[PDB]
């Protein structure tokens, strides 16, 4: 691609600059270029990749929701549908790009729990974003999200402590999948509660800084439980 001539280290440096400048499309392109060098990613690099694409797809999701809401009102000319479709297609292209990087070849080279769980969670997340706009096929997309989350959960429970921030963010997002995508609010509530309680019981093992990291994510579990019950 267009980043093939740039050094890996320069791509990472520029991704960090783009983050500081709130240029998330650039940040994603730089990190895509870094992935395509073929070397595994460090913990920091994995998070740069995630931050970049989360911001890109987050803007698209917010736009899609606005347009879909306008479209649904109009059904209570073709321009509203056309433009919602345009944004939707762009969003799906971003998700497909991320899923392609995970499949070629981030996941298969990831052996440590922290990397493998991170990437499988990401695969669940971007199939979930595809599911949010899918209509009927929606079933196979939902199953793909579920499968990725489940594999990630199984590894995280075996290999990580209950306060691990990757484990917590995985359980959080899988609970959102259950509530928002899979029409399983009881599963969502059960998962959030068990995750929160098992992390609570492990906090005593943590340093002050790790305690801060874990409790910040636990608060999101609690906020969802408040909304859901």
């Amino acid at each position: 691609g267009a980043m093939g001539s740039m050094e890996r280290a320069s791509l990472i440096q520029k991704a960090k600059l783009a983050e500081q400048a709130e240029r998330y499309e650039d940040m994603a392109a730089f990190m895509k270029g870094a992935v395509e060098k073929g070397e595994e990613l460090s913990c920091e690099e994995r998070n740069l990749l995630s931050v970049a694409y989360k911001n890109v797809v987050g803007g698209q999701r917010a736009a899609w929701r606005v347009l879909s809401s306008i479209e649904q009102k109009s059904n209570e000319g073709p321009e509203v549908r056309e433009y919602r479709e345009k944004v939707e297609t762009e969003l799906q292209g971003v998700c497909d790009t991320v899923l392609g990087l995970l499949d070629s070849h981030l996941i298969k080279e990831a052996g440590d729990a922290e990397s493998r769980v991170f990437y499988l969670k990401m695969k669940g997340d971007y199939y979930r974003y595809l599911a949010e706009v899918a209509t009927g096929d929606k079933k196979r997309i939902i199953d793909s999200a579920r499968s990725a989350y489940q594999e990630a959960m199984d590894i995280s429970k075996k290999e990580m402590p209950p306060t691990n921030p990757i484990r917590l963010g995985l359980a959080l997002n899988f609970s959102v999948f259950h509530y928002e995508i899979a029409n399983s609010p009881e599963e969502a509530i059960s998962l959030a509660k068990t995750t929160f309680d098992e992390a609570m019981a492990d906090l005593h093992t943590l340093s002050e800084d790790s305690y801060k990291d874990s409790t910040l994510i636990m608060q999101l579990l609690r906020d969802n439980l408040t909304l859901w019950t």
């Binding site: 995630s50 931050v51 959102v176 509530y179 969502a188 999101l220 906020d223 969802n224 909304l227």
Partner: peptide, 7 residues
């Protein structure tokens, strides 16, 4: 809408 993992 439910809260998902933040950056």
């Amino acid at each position: 809408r439910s809260l998902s993992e933040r950056l």
